[PDB]
């Protein structure tokens, strides 16, 4: 299937990734750059993010979902449901509002597309209404991350997909900070894309530090696999 080979032909091997975020939370401005690589054959991402403005004013875990669904591994029987790769190389827009339970919200807009051989994720983030002593600006969240399934549905009228899901961020008294995500993705080019049947992506994420790195940073290892269609 030359659509599977093509959009899929761009992710059959290791792909370099670049991530660039500009953020403003309750007026605190910050920027983050990231570099790494993705191996969609194995559903694998490995990335290192650096805050280039000094100290990150929010917890690094709260940015994990914002900082690449095109690197999911779709099983051969599910390849007709891979919207993310079908939009490449011209790419897609990924937008979210993330509602932090009892606290503020992030609104994000990203464009994910190829620049030459490098897959780029360029993001703008605005957060509003955070509590000075809540879990986000309080830096109350553990530096860790739970596995989550993400439910993908078509948004036919928008020629894209919508995605809903809840992240639970653990806190060091046993409670969690819920972050309710509402997502929409839409193609940047005008060409054909795959609008899937409902399915999910299974995510596992591990966060770590580069022991040699003095800048504020996060190392993120993610494995993502599609399922939910027998």
From Swiss-Prot:
Annotated effect of mutating residue 193 to A: In mut1.5; shifts fluorescence lifetime from 3.03 to 2.72 ns
Mutagenesis / variant outcome for changing residue 149 to K: Increases fluorescence at warmer temperatures such as 37 degrees Celsius. In Esmerald; leads to brighter fluorescence. In VisGreen; leads to brighter fluorescence
GO biological process: bioluminescence; generation of precursor metabolites and energy
Recorded consequence of changing residue 162 to Q: In R10-3; matures to the red-emitting state with excitation and emission maxima at 555 and 585 nm, respectively
UniProt effect for mutating residue 42 to N: In EBFP1.2; shifts the excitation and emission spectra to shorter wavelengths and increases quantum yields compared to BFP
InterPro entries: GFP, GFP-related, Green_fluorescent_prot
Pfam families on file: GFP (PF01353)
Consequence of substituting residue 99 to S: In alphaGFP/cycle 3 GFP; improves folding at 37 degrees Celsius, reduces aggregation at high concentrations, and increases the diffusibility of the protein inside cells
PTM comment, free text: Contains a chromophore consisting of modified amino acid residues. Maturation of the chromophore requires nothing other than molecular oxygen.
Recorded consequence of changing residue 49 to L: In mut3.3; shifts fluorescence lifetime from 3.03 to 1.88 ns. In R10-3; matures to the red-emitting state with excitation and emission maxima at 555 and 585 nm, respectively
Keywords on record: Chromophore, Luminescence, Photoprotein
Keyword GTP-binding: no
Tissue expression from the record: Photocytes.
Listed result of changing residue 128 to V: In EBFP2.0; shifts the excitation and emission spectra to shorter wavelengths and increases quantum yields compared to BFP
Biotechnology comment: Green fluorescent protein has been engineered to produce a vast number of variously colored mutants, fusion proteins, and biosensors. Further generation of mutants led to more stable proteins (at 37 degrees Celsius for example) with brighter fluorescence and longer fluorescence lifetimes.
Effect the entry attributes to changing residue 67 to M: In RSGFP4; increases fluorescence and shifts the major exitation peak to 489-490 nm
Outcome recorded upon mutating residue 198 to S: In EBFP1.2; shifts the excitation and emission spectra to shorter wavelengths and increases quantum yields compared to BFP
Listed result of changing residue 146 to I: In ECFP; leads to cyan fluorescence, folds faster and more efficiently at 37 degrees Celsius and has superior solubility and brightness
Assembly description: Monomer.
Physiological role: Energy-transfer acceptor. Its role is to transduce the blue chemiluminescence of the protein aequorin into green fluorescent light by energy transfer. Fluoresces in vivo upon receiving energy from the Ca(2+)-activated photoprotein aequorin.
UniProt family annotation: Belongs to the GFP family.
The protein's name in its UniProt record: Green fluorescent protein
Gene of this entry: GFP
């Amino acid at each position: 299937d030359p659509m599977v080979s093509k959009g899929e032909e761009l992710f059959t091997g290791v792909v370099p990734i670049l991530v660039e975020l500009d953020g403003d939370v309750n007026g605190h401005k910050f920027s983050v750059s990231g570099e790494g690589e993705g191996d969609a054959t194995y559903g694998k991402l490995t990335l290192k993010f650096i805050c280039t403005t000094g100290k990150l004013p929010v917890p690094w875990p709260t940015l994990v979902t914002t900082f690449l669904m095109c690197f999911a591994r779709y099983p051969d029987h599910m390849k007709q449901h891979d919207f993310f790769k079908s939009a490449m190389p011209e790419g897609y827009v990924q937008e979210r509002t993330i509602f932090f339970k009892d606290d503020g919200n992030y609104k994000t807009r990203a464009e994910v597309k190829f620049e030459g051989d490098t897959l780029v994720n360029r993001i703008e983030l605005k957060g509003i209404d955070f509590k000075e002593d809540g879990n986000i600006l309080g830096h109350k969240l553990e530096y860790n991350y739970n596995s989550h399934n993400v439910y993908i549905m078509a948004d036919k009228q928008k020629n894209g997909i919508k995605v809903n899901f809840k992240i639970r961020h653990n806190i060091e008294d046993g409670s969690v900070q819920l972050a309710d995500h509402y997502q929409q993705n839409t193609p940047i080019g005008d060409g054909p894309v795959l609008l899937p049947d409902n399915h999910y992506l299974s995510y596992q994420s591990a966060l770590s530090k580069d022991p040699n790195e003095k800048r504020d940073h996060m190392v993120l290892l993610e494995f993502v696999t599609a399922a939910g269609i027998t």
